[PDB]
């Protein structure tokens, strides 16, 4: 059961609102679009197809009715342009801001481009939303905001130094959100995502996340590379857990706003465990080498999600094996 | 005696280098230009004349010799354009990055342009500088970074939450700088300036700083606004102490780099005191009412400059009363 969550989605079904999703053509965005359209919401979407894909939009369309898709207004455009930000904001109740350039290695090769989309574009959306006086604003933050802080599990109040240009960008997101609360009274919720996975996560390109990458590699019969001894560990968070936290945040009482929340399960899985999980799941529906640790890699990562549970009534009910079970058939179809 | 500073300027005169000053037409940038040309350095200046002035460059021209002037190459341009940043970096040894749009209330009223000049512009310059392999990189940071930290005096390690968009941008400069050292080995110095004042600080405009605004006012015979009751206090730091810190930073030992330094004198002057010191200094060269409070603005500010004194051998020569005595003759000439 997902019960404050069930009650809210029930309520959305009876009383549609207007939502903005930036990054709507992307992994998390397109999953939010699918859920909102099935709740019969009115969705305004923004994307420049930098890392996102028309084919994601095309997939959502074949999963919703004609009438539900008629409530989707898609604008191809860039959050780095303030005018565009202000146009897509007209009439909007709830902002779900997911548009960013993720990937730590990307940000090291080209910090300029990562800065402009993740800081400039983020500020544009935050400032448009504040001017338009939307009901809520929730943005994608990042567990890389923990930086070099040694605590584990990671608790929201205790962060360290950021370790890459990417991490600076997501941290600045939070500090700006905080300043906007203070200066204009505009209260927002930042969501520190941890290793999100599930359908429509891109398995291609140099920056592919491990789950999609390894899944694609298993299905092609290509080498699955483990960086290190394999005892490195993550709190992998199935996509529905994130959808859940986004909707809970858009509809949070005022006292829950101007807050950061970890979004994860609270569990740790090793790379050695993961590899066996993926393989075991793929091989029910049909069809490895060790190398150097990646440089400047975090050894172990795990969220404390107590704050989300207590203040938003989050239930992290989809754990990693269930998540892989649910994600694997989408990869099988996509790759074949 | 500014002993180390003297020795370091002697090295420069014997073995001149190429310097980039961004913000060279502004208050601090033009004082840096003046000292560097007088040391026979080759100087590249970048400015967009947003808050800066041609008249500052014309004044400097009259103060240096012809040969010294012939070593100044001025480029009108914007740090928001990456290409421009790359071009003016060419053959540069030392970067003194001063270009920004200062002022807390400016940032509250336009956090967007402020974000673009002070974050994007900073990163463009930091990144161009890294790729050009400069010998050093020193940037204007801000005592606004202390935020709501309640401790006095202000110590570098101990900062609080940012209280304005401008505080955010100045802090983001430090965090980027720190990431560049960790990620690229590129070691910078950030100077948290505290209430600088001296010749060529603009007395005109909605954002004038208190010393020149009030000086202007008593020369015109206008009303002098003391916000609050007279007691509020600052660490006013005459411009020559800033020039010294810039030059010491540019030639610091490697272990002194990747560090933030308070740039001030360690003193605390009351508004009641200043209003008085200013009247007393002005009226020595011939020729009042209380009010409100502001927002983003602080009751008490005093720097601990131990760190600069110890690590760079900074010697804060000039205290507020003598700075004023030194500054007022420029203010008469400029207004009369
Ligand atoms: N995936 C994770 O595990 C993870 C971890 C930490 C943070 N995040 C954050 O989650 C959000 C979504 O990530 P994702 O996994 O869905 O990534 P994704 O790359 O699949 O989606 C991001 C979307 O943003 C769009 N976009 C990028 N720049 C844009 C711009 N300037 N204007 C308009 N659209 C732009 C892209 O086209 C893409 O459709 C991002 O903010 C990312 O930083 C994700
Ligand atoms: N005066 C103080 O007490 C104080 C305190 C804290 C920080 N600072 C910092 O000191 C630096 C210098 O300040 P100042 O007092 O000399 O201010 P100033 O306004 O006199 O100088 C700023 C200079 O930067 C130039 N500039 C601004 N944006 C630019 C851009 N986008 N491209 C190119 N040039 C641009 C302006 O034209 C100007 O000549 C700034 O970074 C400011 O944030 C000053």
Nearest to A264 by CA among A167, A191, A185, A171: A191
Residue to probe by mutation, ligand 2, list B98, B103, B166, B239, most atoms within 8 Å of CB: B98
SS3 A79: coil
Cα of first residue to Cα of last residue in chain A, in angstroms, is 34
Backbone dihedral angles phi then psi of residue A135, each to the nearest 5 degrees: -70, -35
How many Å apart are CA A106 and CA A207, to the nearest integer? 7
Q: What is the number of the ligand closest to the CA of A27?
A: 1
Query: Does B182 contact A at CB distance below 8 Å?
Result: yes
Chain A residues close to B179, C-beta within 8 Å = 162-165, 167-168
- Is B221 part of any known ligand binding site? no
CA of B102 to the centre of ligand 2 (A): 6
CB contact under 8 A, B115 and A111: no
Chain B residues close to A183, C-beta within 8 Å = 108, 164-165, 296
Residues making up chain B, counted from first to last:
336
CA of A117 to the centre of ligand 1 (A): 10
SS3 for chain B, per residue? CCHHHHHHHHHHHHCCCEEEEECCCCHHHHHHHHHHHHCCCEEEEEECCCCCCHHHHHHHHHHCCHHHHCCEEEEECCCCCHHHHHHHCCCCCEEEECCCCCCHHHHHHCHHHHHHHHHHHHHHHHHHHHHCCCCEEEEEEEHHHHCCCCCCCECCCCCCCCCCHHHHHHHHHHHHHHHHHHHHCCCCEEEEECCEECCCCCCCCCCCCHHHHHHHHHHHCCCCEECCCCCCEECCEEHHHHHHHHHHHHCCCHHHCCEEEEECCCCCEEHHHHHHHHHHHHHHHCCCEECCCCCCCCCECCECCHHHHHHHCCCCCCCHHHHHHHHHHHHHHHHC
Q: What is the number of the ligand closest to the CA of B47?
A: 2
The structural domains of chain A, ordered by start, are: 1-193+239-264+304-318 (3.40.50.720), 194-238+265-303+319-336 (3.90.25.10)
Query: Does B119 contact A at CB distance below 8 Å?
Result: yes
Nearest to B107 by CA among B197, B172, B179: B172
Provide the total of helices (H) and of strands (E) in chain A, helices listed first.
14, 13
How many Å apart are CA B12 and CA B270, to the nearest integer? 38
How many Å apart are CA A278 and CA B77, to the nearest integer? 54
Nearest to A202 by CA among A273, A286, A103: A103
Query: Does B124 contact A at CB distance below 8 Å?
Result: yes
Provide the pairing of β-strand A196-197 with A189-193.
unpaired
Chain A residues close to B107, C-beta within 8 Å = none
Strand partners, A203: none
Chain A residues close to B161, C-beta within 8 Å = 178, 182
CA distances from B266 to A206, A237, B27 (A): 51, 50, 22
CA of B281 to the centre of ligand 2 (A): 27
CB contact under 8 A, B82 and A183: no
Instruction: Give the experimental resolution in Å.
Output: 2.2
Q: How many beta-carbon pairs under 8 angstroms link A with B?
A: 68
Interface of A with B in 89-118 (CB under 8 A): 108, 111-112, 115-116
How many Å apart are CA A37 and CA A35, to the nearest integer? 6
Nearest to A186 by CA among A279, A114, A258, A266: A258
**What are B322's two structure tokens?**
């003598």
């Amino acid at each position: 059961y997902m019960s404050r969550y069930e009650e809210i989605t029930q309520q959305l079904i009876f009383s549609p609102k207007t939502w903005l999703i930036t990054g709507v053509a992307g992994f998390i965005g397109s999953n939010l679009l699918e859920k909102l359209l099935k709740l019969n919401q009115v969705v305004i979407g923004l994307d420049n197809f930098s890392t996102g894909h028309q084919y994601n939009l095309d997939e959502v369309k074949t999963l919703v009715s004609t009438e539900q898709w008629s409530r989707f207004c898609f604008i191809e455009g860039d959050i780095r342009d303030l005018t565009t930000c202000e146009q897509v904001m007209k009439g909007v109740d709830h902002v779900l801001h997911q548009a960013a350039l993720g990937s730590v290695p990307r940000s090291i090769v080209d910090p300029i481009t990562t800065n402009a989309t993740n800081i400039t574009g983020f500020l544009n959306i935050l400032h448009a939303a504040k001017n338009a006086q939307v009901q809520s604003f929730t943005y994608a933050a990042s567990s890389s905001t923990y930086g070099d802080h040694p605590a584990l599990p990671k608790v929201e109040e205790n962060i360290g130094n950021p370790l890459s240009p990417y991490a600076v960008t997501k941290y600045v997101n939070e500090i700006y959100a905080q300043v906007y609360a203070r200066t204009y009274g505009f209260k927002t919720i930042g969501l520190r995502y941890f290793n999100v996975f599930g359908r429509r996560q891109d398995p291609n390109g140099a920056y592919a996340a491990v789950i999609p990458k390894w899944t694609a590699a298993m299905l092609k019969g290509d080498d699955v590379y483990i960086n290190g001894d394999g005892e490195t560990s993550r709190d992998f968070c199935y996509i529905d857990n994130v959808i859940q936290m986004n909707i809970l945040s858009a509809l949070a009482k005022d006292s829950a706003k101007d807050n950061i929340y970890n979004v994860a399960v609270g569990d740790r899985t090793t790379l050695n465990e993961l590899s066996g999980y993926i393989y075991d799941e793929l091989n029910l529906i049909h069809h490895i080498k060790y190398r150097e640790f990646r440089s400047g890699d975090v050894r172990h990562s795990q969220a404390d999600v107590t704050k989300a549970i207590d203040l938003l009534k989050y239930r992290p009910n989809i754990k990693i094996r269930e998540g892989l079970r649910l994600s694997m058939p989408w990869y099988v179809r996509f790759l074949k």
